[PDB]
Every structure is written in structure tokens, then in C-alpha cells.
Amino acid sequence: MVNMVSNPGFEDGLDSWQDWQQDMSAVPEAAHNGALGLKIGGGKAAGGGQDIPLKPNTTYILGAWAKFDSKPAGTFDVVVQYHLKDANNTYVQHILNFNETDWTYKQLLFTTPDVFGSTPELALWKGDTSKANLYVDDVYLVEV
Numbered sequence: 757m758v759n760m761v762s763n764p765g766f767e768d769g770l771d772s773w774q775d776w777q778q779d780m781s782a783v784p785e786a787a788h789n790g791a792l793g794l795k796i797g798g799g800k801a802a803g804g805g806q807d808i809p810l811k812p813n814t815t816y817i818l819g820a821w822a823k824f825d826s827k828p829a830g831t832f833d834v835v836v837q838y839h840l841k842d843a844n845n846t847y848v849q850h851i852l853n854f855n856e857t858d859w860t861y862k863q864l865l866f867t868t869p870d871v872f873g874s875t876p877e878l879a880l881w882k883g884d885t886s887k888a889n890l891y892v893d894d895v896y897l898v899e900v
């Protein structure tokens with residue numbers, strides 16, 4: 757069994773993760789497992805992610821642990837996103853939504869198309885604009 761996500765538990769800090777809004781830190785307060793987790797700071801929409809080459813016609817599971825440290829207004833989303841390879845490059849997003857203030861695990865299943873329009877991206881997107889900080893850890897993307 758292989759997790760496609762690089763540094764999936766943030767145990768190597770922010771290695772392999774893009775920081776899009778300069779609002780990410782690998783800290784112990786955000787750890788669900790191991791010593792570190794990802795904190796996305798509250799107050800503005802922010803996130804990060806990584807490119808993950810996926811196999812065509814393949815079924816995957818996407819899962820993650822998350823919690824906000826205070827009640828949020830919006831959500832924190834764990835997303836696999838890519839274009840289909842057709843005349844339109846239709847955009848598809850497989851989305852997990854979190855708004856819980858206790859550590860919560862969520863997972864989904866998806867099957868990739870025969871051809872990709874773009875390289876799949878794993879996005880950790882804290883669209884919430886409340887003061888709440890977001891903790892995320894142990895992100896899984898696994899072929900089943």
C-alpha cells in the first residue's frame with residue numbers, strides 16, 4: 757500500500773508542500789499523529805498543496821484528519837482537482853469539507869478518467885474567514 761502524498765503527516769515540516777498565501781506552519785499544536793501537523797492561520801482564506809501524478813482509469817481514496825481550534829464560519833477543504841482531456845477541459849473537484857472543532861477523519865472515493873487535461877493537484881484549502889485556526893494532519897491519497 758502506497759500513500760501518493762509526499763510528507764503526508766508534516767513530520768518533515770513543510771517539505772513538499774506549496775504555501776500559497778504564506779499562512780502555513782508545521783507545529784506541534786496541529787499534530788494528530790507524530791510530532792507535527794499543519795496549521796493554517798485564521799483570519800483570511802489560505803491554503804497549500806502539491807502536484808500528484810495519478811494513473812488513468814484508477815480508483816483512489818482521499819482522506820485526512822482535521823479540526824478548527826474555534827468555531828469556523830466556512831470550511832476547510834481537502835481536494836483533488838484536475839481537468840478532463842476533452843474539447844472543453846472540464847474542471848473536476850473531489851472535495852472533502854471539514855468544519856469540526858474536534859479531530860475528525862473524512863474520506864472519499866473517486867475514479868480517474870482515461871485521459872487527464874491537466875496534472876492533478878491536491879489542495880488543502882481553508883476558505884473560512886473566521887478567526888479560527890485550522891489543523892490538518894495525516895493526508896492520504898491511496899490507490900485501491
Ligand SMILES: OC[C@H]1O[C@@H](O[C@H]2[C@H](O)[C@H](O)[C@H](O[C@H]3[C@H](O)[C@H](O)[C@H](O[C@H]4[C@H](O)[C@H](O)[C@H](O[C@H]5[C@H](O)[C@H](O)[C@@H](O)O[C@@H]5CO)O[C@@H]4CO)O[C@@H]3CO)O[C@@H]2CO)[C@@H](O)[C@@H](O)[C@@H]1O
Nearest residue numbers: 775776777802803833834835837849851853877879881883
Ligand atoms: O498565491 C500564489 C500562488 O497561487 C497558486 O494558485 C492557487 C491560488 O492562490 C488559490 O489558493 C487557489 O485556491 C483554490 C483551491 O485550490 C481550490 O481550487 C478551491 O476550490 C473550491 C471552490 O473555489 C469552491 O469554493 C468550492 O465550494 C464548494 C464547497 O467545497 C462545497 O462542495 C459546497 O458548499 O459547494 C461549493 C460550491 O458551490 O470548494 C472548492 C474546494 O475548496 O478554490 C480556491 C480558490 O478560491 O489555488 C490555486 C492553486 O490551485 C499558484 O498559482 C502558485 O503558483 C502561486 O504561487
Ligand SMILES: [Ca+2]
Nearest residue numbers: 765789790792
Ligand atoms: Ca503529523
